[PDB]
Amino acid sequence: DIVMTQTPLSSPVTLGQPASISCRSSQSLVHSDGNTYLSWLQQRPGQPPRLLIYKISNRFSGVPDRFSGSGAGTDFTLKISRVEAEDVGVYYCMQVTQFPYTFGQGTKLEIKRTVAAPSVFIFPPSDEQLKSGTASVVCLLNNFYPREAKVQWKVDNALQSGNSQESVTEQDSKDSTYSLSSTLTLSKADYEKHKVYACEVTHQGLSSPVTKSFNRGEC
């Protein structure tokens, strides 16, 4: 099977700055007719892939002029003259010249942006969940740029370890920022045995660790 490997591993690029991904094929992409059929597709996070280029220079309709493609033999390169927040994603290279069609491993295009402190929100557990027997507390870190972020669950000044799970969003296609969500789950009994539930967030954009807290109040 024709092999497709994308030279750039990962790419942190400044906004409005150019970018270029390389694709390498083990065998010639020229077909038995005399053409070369190479496609470039962009997949935004959690989306189906959208075809941007065909052949090497042929740009699909509705595809921005910022995208351009140029290849020779076994090497091919996709270039974005200027990079916008909407370009974040994974770029793949497909070949339709020979069966079975091949895809590159893909290449993630990230975005370098100025630091942004997160906004912290704390959510207490709902009564319905307490009826089910459990209690989940959620700490939300919204629109922070540096991906690295620290979250700490404290119950009545007592630091916790375990019983917490968190997820980070894929880079925003508008802000180019990130969002974090951390849930601390306890039993109803454990939850009632305490008074103050707080989460202390530390991030680069934060001059000093911000803590969002609340008093059970039976909920």
Partner: protein, 231 residues
């Protein structure tokens, strides 16, 4: 309008078969080539095979030759992919790509003479485990949810299996400022997830926020209205 729609997410037992549908809207499934591409989550794209609508020969990848069958219902405009003797290595998102003729319709950026349009995807999980519906609780806005005049609300989709759960807001009318987080795996082996949205706190009294959660494997559709209360 050229619209490609696919079956809902499915969960199948090892050694069983899986069937997914690709329905084409706005253009007859004639002289329009259909392709099936598999994507392992957080992995590469694998081209399963192509099916020619006007009875041309249909080529299957050497990998899936014995296990994949492709068929077309021209009347309903739906192509079908069927993969049998499923193995755990088969758990992935399945796509059908309409790569043929001229789409004709814009579909936001106009596809026009171009051929490719892609399906939304069908998540297929191969596992003997029991399917479990998600539990949806509200993440009510409060003084603890407000910053600089903006309030944050959401929905907690807890303890579901398998993985695919879709969350929408106000039946899809609300998408600005929405964050649906990737799911986490509890020690229990069940997934949990959260979806939040930032809205003007002044509006909290006048607007209605409802989160729409669909867990097709479980066959569950829940609409939970998130309203501000307490602390």
């Amino acid at each position: 309008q050229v619209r490609v729609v696919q079956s809902g997410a499915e969960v199948k037992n090892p050694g069983a078969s899986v069937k997914v549908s690709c329905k084409v809207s706005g253009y007859t499934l004639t002289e329009l080539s259909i392709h099936w591409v598999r994507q392992a989550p957080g992995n590469g794209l694998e081209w399963m095979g192509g099916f020619d609508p006007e009875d041309g020969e249909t080529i299957y990848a050497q990998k899936f030759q014995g296990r994949v069958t492709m068929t077309e219902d021209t009347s309903t405009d739906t192509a079908y992919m069927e993969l049998s003797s499923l193995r755990s290595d088969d758990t992935a998102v399945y796509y059908c790509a309409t790569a043929g003729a001229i789409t004709g319709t814009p579909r936001n950026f106009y596809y026009y003479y171009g051929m490719d349009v892609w399906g939304q995807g069908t998540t297929v999980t191969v596992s003997s485990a029991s399917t479990k519906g998600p539990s949806v609780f509200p993440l009510a806005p409060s003084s603890k949810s407000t910053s600089g005049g903006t309030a944050a609300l959401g929905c907690l989709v807890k303890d579901y299996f398998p993985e695919p759960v879709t969350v929408s807001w106000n039946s899809g009318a609300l998408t600005s400022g929405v964050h649906t987080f990737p799911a986490v795996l509890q020690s229990s082996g069940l997934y949990s997830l959260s979806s939040v949205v930032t809205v003007p706190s002044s509006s909290l009294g006048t607007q209605t926020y409802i989160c729409n959660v669909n867990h097709k494997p479980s066959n569950t559709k829940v609409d939970k209205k998130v309203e501000p209360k307490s602390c």
